[PDB]
Design a protein around this ligand. Structure first.
Ligand SMILES: C[C@H](Cn1cnc2c(N)ncnc21)OCP(=O)(O)O
Ligand SMILES: [Cl-]
Lengths: 115, 502
């Protein structure tokens, strides 16, 4: 079986920065896709960002450019998120997805942007 | 004293040789339109999985939650989220530019997307089957009768394909449409060249090419006017019906009539052609006793072609050339949706580029020769479409210009290979050689959709195969001798002497 456990939640004031990552097990992170989603309360799943395999490319959404940064590593076989200048509308539960239209999605982390 | 003697005696420029020729070559416009139509009647519009009706779109934050996205900012065209799972509730197609296409009607997307190209493959299978079977039937039975039958079958198959309930019905009716269409295409040319003197065959060929280019123009315009596929197929097939209604005034081929060993009806046809031409004083002397005295010298296949080593080698080479040229040409023509620009404009440019390319190859063959023209045209076409395959979608104008140059190069290559096989094969087996070359060209046009079938592997590999084939053909056709000096061999003895004497 494949695990996609993740961690990096916390309570932090607006304009701070967190440390988010997905612990990928059973597959090399450099060989498949990667994606990112949030489900803010009162809203639905929203696409955030994606990084291809072997660093082919990385594209963002309208509220991700210039604010968030996502990187990868090979030693720990994980995908890591960095962010700054957080705003109250960013309060959401973030879900890690291994591939587009893929059956392997993580448990999710709860991150709060307290104005 | 021969058939040409009588034909010149009756005329050659009179009203008959214009009216009959123009009537029989009018449907070549729809020839081109029907051959290319699959591009316009089966264009894939942007599409995505449909969220289930039970789910509330308003309460789920819109359709963006149920549709995973790809790189180009569009929803995924085959998958959907489970709150994954493939399409199970159908599909959603935008109507911004396509009211309806066969892919829109019968959801030939994601899984079982092969059918939108299997349809063209089956149509080309029908073309080849009709060509060979109805060539045999025309040899056995006649020309006017088989051409009329092809007219009717084409019209019926076009209408039936326009109104097709299922998909297998559509494929079978396309197969029968090709069955009739190859036969009409070959028989129009054979009747025109059999009812004209020797020194007008080049004129007939040039007119056929001009009508084909005008057919490309007409298809572009008719696609601009009528976007709906159900209306488009019917509107492009009903003029065949009106031409079948008005094509009962055709005059059968007198040469084939004389070739049957019987001459009374041949005399009747020649008398009729004298009446319509308006020249009766000169045609009065025509009677039975002059037919035998004028037509007696000429009265007196695969196995022999494959037996002789020189004949076998010449076959293999020419078959490879025809196969590669037709394969690449139809692979390039059948795919114009993925060029960025509107299909109508690129189709217009493809049609327009025919005449300048024809002038270029004519100048080259009348100036330098044929084999260098083959090399240049094939190599340039292969390189151009390979670069098209290697240039990403982000660039549009350069890709379209490269595709236009490639289409022009393929047209010039077609004209050049026709002339080269005309002035290459010995007169003993020249007609059978042309038939085999045409059959191999139809085989290549059959395979081309099969090659484009497997684009699921790589995004642009079919373009790579289309660009790899003609470079191989040009490399392997190097050994072929050049016939600029007009040797015009008759039997296999001349070929070996000419090759040794070259
Ligand atoms: C002058 C052309 C030469 N030729 C012979 N075969 C072909 C194919 N398959 N495509 C285009 N052109 C071809 O024939 C008249 P047609 O294509 O059937 O209107
Ligand atoms: Cl043909």
């Amino acid at each position: 079986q494949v695990q996609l456990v993740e961690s990096g939640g916390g309570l932090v004031q607006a304009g701070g920065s967190l440390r988010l990552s997905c612990a990928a097990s059973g597959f090399p992170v450099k060989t498949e896709w990667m994606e990112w989603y949030r489900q803010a309360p009162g809203k639905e799943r929203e696409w955030v960002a994606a990084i291809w395999s072997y660093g082919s490319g990385t594209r963002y959404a309208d509220s991700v450019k210039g604010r968030f940064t996502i990187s990868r590593d090979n030693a720990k076989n994980t995908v890591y998120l960095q962010m700054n200048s957080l705003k109250p509308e960013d309060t959401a539960v973030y879900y890690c997805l291994v591939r587009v239209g893929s059956w392997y999605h993580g448990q999710g982390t709860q991150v709060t942007v307290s104005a | 004293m021969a058939f040409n003697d009588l034909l010149k005696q009756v005329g050659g420029v009179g009203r008959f040789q214009l009216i009959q020729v123009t009537m029989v070559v009018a449907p070549l416009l729809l020839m081109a339109s029907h051959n290319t139509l699959q591009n316009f009647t089966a264009a894939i519009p942007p599409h995505h999985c449909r969220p289930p009706a039970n789910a509330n779109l308003s309460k789920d934050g819109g359709l963006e939650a149920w549709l995973p996205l790809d790189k180009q900012g569009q929803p995924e065209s085959c998958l959907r989220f489970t709150s994954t799972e493939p399409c199970i509730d159908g599909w959603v197609y935008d109507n911004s530019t396509f009211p309806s296409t066969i892919v829109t009607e019968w959801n030939l997307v994601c899984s079982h997307r092969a059918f939108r190209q299997l349809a063209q493959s089956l149509y080309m299978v029908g073309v080849l089957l009709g060509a060979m079977v109805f060539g045999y039937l025309a040899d056995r039975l006649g020309r006017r009768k088989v051409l009329i039958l092809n007219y009717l079958q084409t019209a019926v198959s076009g209408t039936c394909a326009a109104y097709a309930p299922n998909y297998t019905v559509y494929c079978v009716f396309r197969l029968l449409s090709g069955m009739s269409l190859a036969s009409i295409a070959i028989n129009c040319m054979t009747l025109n060249v059999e009812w004209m003197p020797i020194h007008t065959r080049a004129y007939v060929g040039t007119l056929i090419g001009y009508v084909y280019s005008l057919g490309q123009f007409l298809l572009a315009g008719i696609a601009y006017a009528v976007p709906h596929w159900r209306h488009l197929q019917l509107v492009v097939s009903v003029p065949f019906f009106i031409a079948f209604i008005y094509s009962w005034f055709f005059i059968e081929s007198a040469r084939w009539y004389s070739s049957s060993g019987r001459l009374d009806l041949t005399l009747r046809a020649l008398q009729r052609v004298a009446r319509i031409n308006g020249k009766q004083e000169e045609g009065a002397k025509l009677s039975i006793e002059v037919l035998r005295t004028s037509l007696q010298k000429e009265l007196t296949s695969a196995m022999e072609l494959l037996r002789c080593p020189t004949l076998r080698h010449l076959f293999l080479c020419l078959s490879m050339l025809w196969f590669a040229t037709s394969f690449a040409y139809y692979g390039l023509v059948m795919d114009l949706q993925g060029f960025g620009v509107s299909m109508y404009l690129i189709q217009v440019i493809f049609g327009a580029v025919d005449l300048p390319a024809k002038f270029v190859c004519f100048l080259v063959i009348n100036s330098m020769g044929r084999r260098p023209a083959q090399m240049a045209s094939l190599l340039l076409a292969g390189i151009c479409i390979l670069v098209n395959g290697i240039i990403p979608k982000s660039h549009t104008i350069i890709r379209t210009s490269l595709a236009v140059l490639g289409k022009g190069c393929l047209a010039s290559s077609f004209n050049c290979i026709f002339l080269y096989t005309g002035e290459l094969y010995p007169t003993v087996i020249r007609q059978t050689g042309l038939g085999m070359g045409s059959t191999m060209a139809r085989v290549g046009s059959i395979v081309s959709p099969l090659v484009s079938m497997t684009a699921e592997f790589y995004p642009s590999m079919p373009l790579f195969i289309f660009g790899a084939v003609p470079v191989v053909a040009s490399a392997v056709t190097a050994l072929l001798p050049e016939t600029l000096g007009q040797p015009l061999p008759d039997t296999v003895q001349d070929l070996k002497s000419r090759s040794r004497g070259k």
